[PDB]
Amino acid sequence: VYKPVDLSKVTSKCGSLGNIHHKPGGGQVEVKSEKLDFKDRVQSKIGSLDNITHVPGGGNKKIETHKLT
Amino acid sequence: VYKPVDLSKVTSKCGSLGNIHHKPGGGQVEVKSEKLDFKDRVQSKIGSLDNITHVPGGGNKKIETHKLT
Amino acid sequence: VYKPVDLSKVTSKCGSLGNIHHKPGGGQVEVKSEKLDFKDRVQSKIGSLDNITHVPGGGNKKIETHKLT
Amino acid sequence: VYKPVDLSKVTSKCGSLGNIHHKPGGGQVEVKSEKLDFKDRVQSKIGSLDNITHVPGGGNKKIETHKLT
Amino acid sequence: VYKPVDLSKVTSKCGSLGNIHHKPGGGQVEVKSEKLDFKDRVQSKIGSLDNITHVPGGGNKKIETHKLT
Amino acid sequence: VYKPVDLSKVTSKCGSLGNIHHKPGGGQVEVKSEKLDFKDRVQSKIGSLDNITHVPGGGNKKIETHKLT
Amino acid sequence: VYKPVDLSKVTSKCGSLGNIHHKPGGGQVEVKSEKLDFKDRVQSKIGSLDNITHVPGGGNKKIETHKLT
Amino acid sequence: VYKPVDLSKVTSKCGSLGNIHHKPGGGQVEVKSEKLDFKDRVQSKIGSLDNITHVPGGGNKKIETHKLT
Amino acid sequence: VYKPVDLSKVTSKCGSLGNIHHKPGGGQVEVKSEKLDFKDRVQSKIGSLDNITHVPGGGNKKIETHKLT
Numbered sequence: 001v002y003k004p005v006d007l008s009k010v011t012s013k014c015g016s017l018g019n020i021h022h023k024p025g026g027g028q029v030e031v032k033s034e035k036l037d038f039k040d041r042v043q044s045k046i047g048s049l050d051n052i053t054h055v056p057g058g059g060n061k062k063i064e065t066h067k068l069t
Numbered sequence: 070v071y072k073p074v075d076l077s078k079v080t081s082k083c084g085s086l087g088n089i090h091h092k093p094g095g096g097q098v099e100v101k102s103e104k105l106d107f108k109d110r111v112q113s114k115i116g117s118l119d120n121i122t123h124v125p126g127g128g129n130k131k132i133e134t135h136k137l138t
Numbered sequence: 139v140y141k142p143v144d145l146s147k148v149t150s151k152c153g154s155l156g157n158i159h160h161k162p163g164g165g166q167v168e169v170k171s172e173k174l175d176f177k178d179r180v181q182s183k184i185g186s187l188d189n190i191t192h193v194p195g196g197g198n199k200k201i202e203t204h205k206l207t
Numbered sequence: 208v209y210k211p212v213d214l215s216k217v218t219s220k221c222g223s224l225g226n227i228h229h230k231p232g233g234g235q236v237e238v239k240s241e242k243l244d245f246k247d248r249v250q251s252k253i254g255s256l257d258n259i260t261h262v263p264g265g266g267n268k269k270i271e272t273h274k275l276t
Numbered sequence: 277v278y279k280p281v282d283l284s285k286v287t288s289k290c291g292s293l294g295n296i297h298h299k300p301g302g303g304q305v306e307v308k309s310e311k312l313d314f315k316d317r318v319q320s321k322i323g324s325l326d327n328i329t330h331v332p333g334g335g336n337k338k339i340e341t342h343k344l345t
Numbered sequence: 346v347y348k349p350v351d352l353s354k355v356t357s358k359c360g361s362l363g364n365i366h367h368k369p370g371g372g373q374v375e376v377k378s379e380k381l382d383f384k385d386r387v388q389s390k391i392g393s394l395d396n397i398t399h400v401p402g403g404g405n406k407k408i409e410t411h412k413l414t
Numbered sequence: 415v416y417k418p419v420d421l422s423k424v425t426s427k428c429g430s431l432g433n434i435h436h437k438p439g440g441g442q443v444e445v446k447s448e449k450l451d452f453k454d455r456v457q458s459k460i461g462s463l464d465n466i467t468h469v470p471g472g473g474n475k476k477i478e479t480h481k482l483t
Numbered sequence: 484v485y486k487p488v489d490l491s492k493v494t495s496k497c498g499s500l501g502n503i504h505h506k507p508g509g510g511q512v513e514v515k516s517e518k519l520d521f522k523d524r525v526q527s528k529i530g531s532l533d534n535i536t537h538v539p540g541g542g543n544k545k546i547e548t549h550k551l552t
Numbered sequence: 553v554y555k556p557v558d559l560s561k562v563t564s565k566c567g568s569l570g571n572i573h574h575k576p577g578g579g580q581v582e583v584k585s586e587k588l589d590f591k592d593r594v595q596s597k598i599g600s601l602d603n604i605t606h607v608p609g610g611g612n613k614k615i616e617t618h619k620l621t
Contacts, residue, residue: 001070001139004204008077008146010129012196015234015304015373016085016154020193023161025117025186026095027498027567028429030168034103037175042111044182048094048163049114051189052121055089056128058081059194060148062201065134066073069207083195084234084304093186096429096498096568128194153303153372154234165567166498208277211342215284219334221402222441222511223292227331231393232324233302240309249318255301258327266332266401267286272341280411282351288403290359291441291510291580296400297365301393303372310379317386324370324393335401336355338408345414360510360579361441415484418549422491426541428609430499434538438600439531440509447516456525459532462508466535473539473608474493479548484553487618491560495610499568503607506575508600513582520589527596531577534603542608543562546615 002068010060017057024051071137079129086126093120140206148198160191209275217267224264231258278344286336293333300327347413355405367398416482424474431471438465485551493543500540507534554620562612574605 025048094117163186232255301324370393439462508531577600 004073004142006075006144010079010148012081012150013304014083014152014195016302017195018088019156020089020158022191023092024189026164028096028166028496029098029185031100033171035173037106039177040109041179044113046115047098047185048117049187050119051093053091053191054123055193057083057086057126057195058129060129060196060198063132065203067136067205069138082235097427151373166565210279213282217286219288219403220442221290221333224333226294227296229298229329231300231327234304236305236323238307242311244313246315252321254323256325261330264333267334267336270339274343276345278347280349284353286355288357289511290402292361293402295363298398299368300396301370305392306375308377312381314383320389322391326395328397330399333402336403336405340409342411358580417486420489424493426495426610428497428540431540433501435504436536437506438534441511443512443530445514449518451520454523458527460529462531464533469538471540474541474543477546481550483552487556489558493562495564497566497609500609502570503572505605507603509578511580512599515584518587523592525594529598531600537606540609543610543612549618552621
């Protein structure tokens with residue numbers, strides 16, 4: 001028999017949140033290539049990629065997991 | 070027999086959220102290539118790609134998972 | 139028999155949070171390559187990539203996990 | 208016998224006046240009360256109140272007062 | 277016999293006035309109260325109140341006062 | 346006989362006046378109270394109150410006062 | 415016999431160009447003159463004059479000159 | 484016989500160019516003159532004059548000059 | 553016989569160029585003159601004059617000159 005109980009409070013009382021500046025790759029980017037051999041798969045990423053600005057007014061996280069067998 | 074109970078509060082009381090500036094790839098990007106060999110698949114990404122600005126007034130996350138056998 | 143109980147308070151009372159500046163790769167980036175041999179897979183990442191600015195008004199995290207067998 | 212004379216000049220030659228930012232109470236305000244007794248008058252002010260932004264292009268002030276008997 | 281004379285010059289020659297920032301109470305304000313007794317008059321002020329931003333292009337002041345008996 | 350004379354020059358020649366930052370109470374404020382007795386008047390002030398930002402392009406003041414009896 | 419040849423490249427690869435603020439003469443200007451004598455030509459410039467904001471996306475300059483006899 | 488040859492590259496790869504602030508003469512300017520004698524030409528410049536903000540995305544310059552006689 | 557040859561590369565790879573502040577004559581300027589004699593030409597410059605803010609994304613310069621006689 002399995003009767004877990006959770007009464008969790010997960011909280012923030014943030015007053016003010018602002019003036020967040022993210023400037024990835026603000027300058028010149030250059031690649032020059034001569035007579036290369038590639039004999040299998042290529043992934044190439046060039047420039048400014050996958051950059052995140054994440055500014056949630058609440059970013060609070062609860063994870064829970066339960067098993068029996 | 071299996072009777073889990075959860076009464077969780079997941080919360081934010083954020084006052085003010087603003088002036089978020091994200092400037093990925095603000096400059097010149099250049100690639101030049103001479104007489105290259107590729108014998109299999111190419112993925113190429115060039116420039117400013119997949120960049121995220123995510124600013125939710127609440128970004129709180131609850132995950133839960135249950136199993137039996 | 140299995141009866142865990144949880145009364146957790148996970149909290150923040152953040153006053154003010156701001157003027158956050160992130161500037162990765164603010165300058166010039168250059169790559170030059172001559173007559174290279176690649177005999178298998180290539181991942182190439184060039185420039186400003188995968189940078190995160192993460193500024194949650196609450197970044198509180200509770201993880202919990204339960205098993206029987 | 209009473210013959211006062213005033214030839215006052217009260218002056219400003221202000222060139223430029225601007226970018227005035229007033230942000231009173233920019234964050235969260237909260238009050239919680241349990242089972243209180245008040246036996247006489249209550250004045251209650253809660254939140255952002257009576258805040259002034261006063262930006263006159265001339266705010267010069269002359270006061271004068273005269274009496275006799 | 278009463279014949280005062282005043283030729284006052286009260287002056288400013290201000291060139292430029294600006295970028296004035298006033299941020300009173302930019303954070304979080306909280307009050308919690310249990311079972312209090314108040315047996316006479318209450319004035320209560322909670323939050324951001326009576327804050328002044330006074331930025332006159334001229335704030336020059338002359339006060340004068342005259343009496344007899 | 347009473348014949349005072351005043352030739353006052355009261356002056357400012359201010360060049361440039363700016364980037365004035367006033368930030369009172371920028372953080373969290375909290376009050377918690379249990380089972381108090383108040384037998385007479387209460388004034389209560391909680392938070393950010395009566396703060397002044399006063400930035401006059403001229404703040405010159407002349408006060409003068411005259412009597413006979 | 416005269417056969418000059420020029421294959422010049424004059425170039426810019428400017429990425430981003432912006433937020434240019436020019437504020438000449440931002441304050442009060444005053445002139446007062448008593449009973450002056452001028453016995454020949456007068457040029458007078460008073461105030462804010464001949465000021466330039468020049469922000470070309472390309473301002474590259476080639477001059478060339480040739481002579482014979 | 485005169486056969487000069489020029490193959491010049493004159494170049495820039497500028498990434499980002501910005502937030503340029505020029506504030507000449509931000510304050511008060513005053514002139515007072517009593518009973519002056521001028522017996523020949525006058526040029527007078529008073530205030531904020533001839534100031535330049537020059538922000539070219541490329542300002543590259545080639546000058547060349549050729550003669551015979 | 554005259555056959556000069558030029559293969560010049562004149563170059564810049566500037567990353568980021570910004571937050572440039574120029575503030576000449578930011579304060580009060582005053583001139584007062586009594587009963588002067590000027591017997592020939594006058595140039596008079598008073599205030600903030602001829603100031604340059606020059607911020608080229610490339611400031612590269614080639615000068616060249618050729619003669620025979």
